[PDB]
Design a protein around this ligand. Structure first.
Ligand code: DTP
Ligand code: CA
Ligand code: MG
Length: 430
DNA sequence: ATTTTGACGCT
DNA sequence: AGCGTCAA
């Protein structure tokens, strides 16, 4: 009752760019705008692997992970843009730079946590308080929320999409108490007004559209964001949680899409997030551990305390290349040449990072996979990163992996290498 | 033969 | 530290 926390103490948003790499390529090449199109890396093997797909192309069934040759079978007029290739490998620089454009705009509104190349969480609690003080008891107009959905509404006693959206928004705004500056629902609504402004700024200043979720924590904001993609935002209130979770597959909640989620389903014999409420906290801890159990117990009630971390920049800078099938590296010269290629890209990115962000990486992580090994990585070894020099970094990586070559003949490498990975970590201010 | 990334947890 | 999980 009066002491049961309800996890309504924050306003958190999650902004996720729509079909991001596709929009970057469509901004650059207007011929691709409003077309079924996809972004592909490489081309020789089955037309290249698709990594991003416009919504027009998704209507034909085109998906990520599909080979372009296969996507063309579903969508013969599919347009394709290829990822840049530099030093023999795919180079994602254009998308990292576009990401910086968006992150820098979002940071004008609030502290952000960069969650991925095209997603950031926003802690809007303070901005909401300020905006509520400015508003001075003034009601919030539907015109301030032109792309907002209120999850769960309309309800109770038009057949078009926008009509339903407006009916739900009208019900929501009709039922708010605007004089109570401590109302969580009012706080979320002001949050959504701010997110409309943030999304408009992103689109105005970059050309890119995005979706967003607004709720009281990161997990619900993320879930909310996906409910009405693309180019829309969704408010998930605390009160919407029981109905929303009553038919929500467990795997849809962030962190439960893999083995742990499968084990929750198997061990407990349930399917939906809401079914978790019938277990005690101790029961969940007994099956899934102290941390996961407490997290599950609160999360299924819509409560999560994970903070929006103040971090706009990635914590690592990495370069990776697979060598599948017959391309596996089988000679010392091959391994050294590709380590150099990776190291040269890493050097270029690190030097730019040091100039832009006043920091230096101090550790180099080298990871490889050997042909035959079932694990993704066969070996992961660190060494010191003391100079931004590609030849030195490639030599040091070779030094830390050379003992993996079983072959008695020095010129041959066995078992052949199917993956090389260099990652700069442990940044210090400079 | 999706590939190329990142973050964080465990021991 | 090195390995594993989960997510763009
Ligand atoms: N598995 C992957 N491998 C390589 N790149 C990926 C992968 N998944 C996503 N990306 C890249 C391309 C995407 O445009 C970008 C953002 O990913 P993601 O948010 O999951 O999808 P998306 O932005 O393309 O579409 P949308 O968010 O509208 O559903 O990251
Ligand atoms: Ca996205
Ligand atoms: Mg994303």
């Amino acid at each position: 009752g009066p002491h049961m926390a309800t996890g309504q103490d924050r306003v958190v948003a999650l902004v996720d760019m729509d079909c991001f790499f596709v929009q970057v390529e469509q901004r650059q090449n207007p011929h691709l705008r409003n077309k079924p199109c996809a972004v592909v890396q490489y081309k020789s093997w089955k037309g290249g692997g698709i990594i991003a797909v416009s919504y027009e192309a998704r209507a034909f069934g085109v998906t990520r992970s599909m080979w372009a040759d296969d996507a063309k079978k579903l969508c013969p007029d599919l347009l394709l843009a290829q990822v840049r290739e530099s030093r023999g490998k795919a180079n994602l620089t254009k998308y990292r730079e576009a990401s910086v454009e968006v992150m820098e705009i979002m940071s004008r509104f609030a502290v952000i946590e960069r969650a991925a190349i095209d997603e950031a969480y926003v802690d809007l609690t303070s901005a909401v308080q300020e905006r509520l003080q400015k508003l001075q008891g003034q009601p919030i107009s539907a015109d301030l929320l032109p792309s907002t959905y209120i999850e769960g509404l309309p309800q109770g006693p038009t057949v078009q999409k926008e009509g339903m959206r407006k009916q739900g928004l009208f019900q929501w705004l009709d039922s708010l108490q605007i004089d109570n500056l401590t109302s969580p629902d009012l706080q979320l609504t002001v949050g959504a007004v701010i997110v409309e402004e943030m999304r408009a700024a992103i689109e105005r200043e970059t050309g890119f559209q995005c979706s967003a979720g607004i709720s009281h924590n990161k997990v619900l904001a993320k879930l909310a964001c996906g409910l009405n993609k693309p180019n829309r935002q969704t408010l998930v209130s605390h009160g919407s949680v029981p109905q929303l979770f009553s038919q929500m597959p467990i795997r849809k909640i962030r962190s439960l899409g893999g083995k742990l989620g499968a084990s929750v389903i198997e061990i407990l014999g349930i399917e939906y997030m809401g079914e978790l409420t019938q277990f005690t906290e101790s029961q969940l801890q007994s099956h899934f551990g102290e941390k996961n159990g407490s997290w599950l117990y609160a999360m299924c009630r819509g409560i999560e305390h994970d903070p929006v971390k103040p971090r706009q920049l990635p914590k690592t800078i990495g370069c990776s290349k697979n060598f599948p099938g017959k391309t596996a590296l089988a000679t010392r010269e091959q391994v050294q040449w590709w380590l150099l290629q990776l190291a040269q890209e890493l050097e270029e990115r690190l030097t730019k990072d040091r100039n832009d962000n006043d920091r230096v990486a101090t550790q180099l992580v080298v990871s490889i996979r050997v042909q035959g090994d079932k694990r993704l990585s066969s070996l992961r070894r660190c060494c010191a990163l003391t100079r931004y020099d590609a030849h030195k970094m490639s030599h040091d990586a070779f030094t830390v992996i050379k003992n993996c070559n079983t072959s008695g003949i020095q010129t041959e490498w066995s078992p052949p290498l199917t993956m090389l990975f260099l990652c700069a970590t442990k940044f210090s201010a400079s």
